[PDB]
Amino acid sequence: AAPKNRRTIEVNRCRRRNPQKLIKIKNNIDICPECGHLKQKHVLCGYCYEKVRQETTKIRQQIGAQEGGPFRAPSVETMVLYTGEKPSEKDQGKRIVERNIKRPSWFT
């Protein structure tokens, strides 16, 4: 549907420059102490979260190799151990995952 005459640039300029059509500023921006990067007040930091996922992938890779087959999910609890930490009696009766890396500072 076309108007019976061409729409003037002046008319068009007013429509696009109306405040309703302009981009709004956001004041909910926050700083992440953990990563030192920006975050939203309702959103978690991704720089630190990225570390968790990367460690999770590495941990998951170790578990997959240890299982050695599909549909081999243990019926017993699982635990992760890093270099410098040795399985204890409390770790008995739990699947033990060994990580070549030392215990991460953030991970406890």
Identity of residue 77? E
C-beta closer to Zn ion: residue 52 or 101: 52
Applying CB under 8 A, does 14 fall inside the site for another protein? no
Residue nearest to Zn ion (CB): 35
Residue 57 in contact with another protein, rule: CB under 8 A: no
Return phi, psi of residue 89, to 5°. Answer: -60, -35
- DSSP assignment of 60-96, as one string? HHHHHHHH-STT---SSEEEEEEET----GGGTTEEE
59 binds Zn ion (CB under 5 A): no
Structure-block tokens of residue 61: 């890779």
The reply on whether position 80 binds Zn ion by CB under 5 A is no
Only one of the segments 9-17, 48-56, 73-81, 83-91 lies at the binding site for Zn ion (rule: CB under 5 A); that segment is: 48-56
Report d(CA 79, CA 93) in Å as an integer.
10
CB of 46 to another protein, least distance (A): 5
Tokens for 88, please give them: 């204890």
Residue 60, binding choice from another protein, Zn ion, none, Cβ under 5 to 8 Å by partner class: another protein
Check residue 96 for interaction with Zn ion (CB under 5 A): no
